[model samples]
Target: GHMATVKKLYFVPAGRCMLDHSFVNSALTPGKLLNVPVWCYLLETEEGPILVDTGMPESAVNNEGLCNGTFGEGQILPKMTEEDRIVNILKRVGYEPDDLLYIISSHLHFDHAGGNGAFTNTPIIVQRTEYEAALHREEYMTECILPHLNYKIIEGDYEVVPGVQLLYTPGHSPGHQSLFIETEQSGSVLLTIDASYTKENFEDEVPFAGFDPELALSSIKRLKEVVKKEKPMIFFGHDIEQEKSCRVFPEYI
Candidate 1:
């Protein structure tokens, strides 16, 4: 018999995206500039490596049309190299794209799921609603969505591995989710993903553009409840201020 234990966890930095401040908070901040960090996570468990959200793609970096069409012309500013890509990130950790057992997407947004093509044959776990909605949207048609990939559609909360669980925290997107990792050293770590873009957004209940504000608020409330019960270390999405303090890949918790 075999039992699963979380051996390590690493943060993979994809790059950054610049957007309008109002894109984050419609009512409070307008005409302000905000630079968001695109990130992905790698988890090492007894089963194998699991990846959450594939950050922006290199194609988007060299070709502006890739982003300009979806995020608006001149909106997304990506900073990355061959090494910063997710494929290389896995390599540095002594794994390959093919080695990942599961690839989960918090939601199929450009900055979040842009690099999905890199893991062509890997099973990408996504909410049914999110996957369906993504198919209808133009952002993913050419880049994120591919015919060769495997999609593992799920609904609500799910136990991914023995120690890893997926939290169904929608509103940011139709099927947005988060991850809860149980580890020996850190106890528990919550990957808030895009459900909460930053600590400030979570505290203030701010909502991003093109999303249902009401659902977003409810999701935040649910996450708060989970926080009280689990007492896990919270990782906010795109929080450069917080990211500065986090230990990146080649480092583990």
Candidate 2:
């Protein structure tokens, strides 16, 4: 390969949730998860498949407990379901869940990490801060919402295969990470996790401030640099347009 080439990727509409207007003001239009899509991916390599972000949980389908009143018990992200289970999605495309060599997460919010349990024994990779935040909320982090566990837990930014590398980008969560996979050339794909939850937020440079506003701002800026420099198909963690536009591939790499 002269530069780099992406073998394959996948999309799974985990369901929809909501976002407030304060998310970005102008660029971040006040919106709801009118069937907001969550994504999962399979990066083909000489090594194995790398799954990014768990999508949603089975409980998210009908279980109100998952939300834990973040917005409300009944509110949904829109168009998401248990059918979008990470395992089910893979099987649909003729791959087994256990066949995956690694599962890399952008962050571990309840919606994103819902399917983590399904991966079971598969190696779970996340930023060290993400793991820490999941457990230690420091200021306002509460466990009332999170009551389940998933993942075998591999820490730090390390190469999963030949071309795939997980980069730590914390802001959305203390340990949020982004995925950068080199295809064949300089060609790559960077999955920006919760760094910015919506495309609207990304375009207008909005940082969903839960922890450090400066850190959040930096994370978003870093994504821009990666996009400008690397120029791989850029995917957003929860961008309405990216999801609607089919950022993940096999369908669109």
Candidate 3:
């Protein structure tokens, strides 16, 4: 856990993207291209900014091949543009990519790590295990998965900023970890990414077919424990339902 006092939380909507519905659920939501929120988190601290889960790479939209293929009509991602680049979004809010000193990730999937190119000079915080997976193309980095990233990797589970802490919680991918954000007024907000894709999946319990089922399950439980112990405002990854329930941009926090 990190400090309990920090600045405001920013939910950076890098782009709008979709994934195979069956990747998450095979029965009801299967086959349907799920138009989900492509988002990242900006944790402002006195020290520097901490980013959690960089969203879609620009190629994901401009070059569909980076994400989709010719299967069955193929899935189409929406609401993203080159202008809405992750770094650009930060600039809109009066900050630059370099302003974001610490970048953390939930996993290294194509959609998740694509935009990592924006923070090449920034000190990225990730699990060693995850990097190993990405490097050697382990089980986490599936064969045929495309990538769009170029960032210097930083490892460990310490305070990346004054109030933000990087926690080691593997499962969804080899090194998928969440961010613990403590605040003064808005309470605590935990950025739970693919490890907990949807709140319902986390609550009722369902595993993404693309994810490591056993590790994903265990990771969900680990995050649940943190939620129970910390009792913070939970933020999920690709949870359209949960996103509607909460706010985005201006009021997301």
Candidate with top TM-score is: 1
Report the candidate with higher TM-score, 1 versus 3: 1
User: lDDT tens digits, residues 1-253, model 3?
Assistant: 3555677687777776666686556456555777788787767666676777666666555754543443322554445677767777777777777777677766787567666767766766667677778876533224212343433445646566655766666776777777777776687777777767777777877766444678777777877898899888877778878777766567635
Candidate 1, 1-253: lDDT as tens digits: 1645487888877777776776666675455567778888888888888988887776766553555556455555566566667777677768788889999898888777877888877899989878887877654544566656888989999988888899998887888898888875788898888888888778788777646678888988999999899888998987868988998877888
For the record, the alpha-carbon RMSD of candidate 1 to the native fold, in angstroms, is: 2.0
- Which 10 successive residues of model 2 have the least lDDT summed? 138-147
Candidates' C-alpha lDDT: 0.79, 0.62, 0.67
**Where does the lowest 10-residue lDDT sum fall in candidate 3?**
139-148
Off by over 4 Å in 1: 1-4, 63-66, 69-71, 139-141
lDDT of 2 by residue, 149-212 (tens): 4454556567666677777676667777778876653367777766776665566765554466
Q: Candidate 3, after superposition: displacement of residue 248 in Å?
A: 2.4
TM-scores for every candidate against the unseen true structure: 0.91, 0.78, 0.83
What overall lDDT, based on C-alpha atoms, would model 2 receive against the true structure?
0.62
